[PDB]
Amino acid sequence: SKGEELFTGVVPILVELDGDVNGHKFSVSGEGEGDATYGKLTLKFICTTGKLPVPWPTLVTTLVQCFSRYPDHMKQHDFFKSAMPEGYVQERTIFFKDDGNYKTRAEVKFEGDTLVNRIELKGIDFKEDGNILGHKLEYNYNSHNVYIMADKQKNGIKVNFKIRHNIEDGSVQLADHYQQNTPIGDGPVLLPDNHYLSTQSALSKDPNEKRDHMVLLEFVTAAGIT
């Protein structure tokens, strides 16, 4: 696609989330860089409203799949970059097993020469002493398969996967993700064959940062077609 040309080098990223979980209102701002030729993302996020009322790991999927690497044999299947620069809307429902759910709407597009992910998130029905509002999640992340299929009739994609969140007692909290992406522009997009993304994420801290924050390194590569 013509959109993939915008990603051949290092692209600056801004992420801006406004959230409300069980009435707890919060905001997150992130900035960093994406290097899609290598499937590489590097971001730092800050809670601009004080302490984050939910665990940082629960927000990772919400907080730019256009920076996935599509290997040479898969380039025709990269919807995300084909939608650029006008971008796409990314919606999800995330069901935390035996707890509440997040619903999210994001616009991902170029604003000037920066890729910007702007999100609204609403969470409901969380248990006050459950793993999310009780902060029982380990500060860590697993490696996932993100399954993608075309919705040719609606000129976009449908996506589904479960995130595994390690709990401090050795259990695992599942978060079942239902996702749709829809182009913002009228231009043609690439509608993929079924495939998946293989994801890797690591979470850290900046020893110089005093605000509630998360350092995130990711590497993502598309797969499932030979």
Partner: protein
Amino acid sequence: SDLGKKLLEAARAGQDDEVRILMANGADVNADDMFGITPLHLAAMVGHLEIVEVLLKHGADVNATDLLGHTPLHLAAIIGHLEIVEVLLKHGADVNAQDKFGKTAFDISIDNGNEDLAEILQKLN
């Protein structure tokens, strides 16, 4: 520190004379960002052979790991830069190194359809 940041950005950009001057002026060859990425990671990833050699000759850690446990060799397997793989191995890179999710450079090569690189790596066991 300031020199470290500049060294990272020169390595990513393939600015070989900038790398050489920064190191002559005392930049730490093993400087890393908050993501654990070093100059050698960046040069190996992008395939900048002369920069990789300069860094290694000045003592770049061939076994450095980012936050995900990727070594420069892991990153060189994404595009499959053979001359860089060769140099890294000649400087003692561990061909079997696993990232924090257990992946090797062989595994990365296969994911990317780098079939020839995968064959090379396999023969080194």
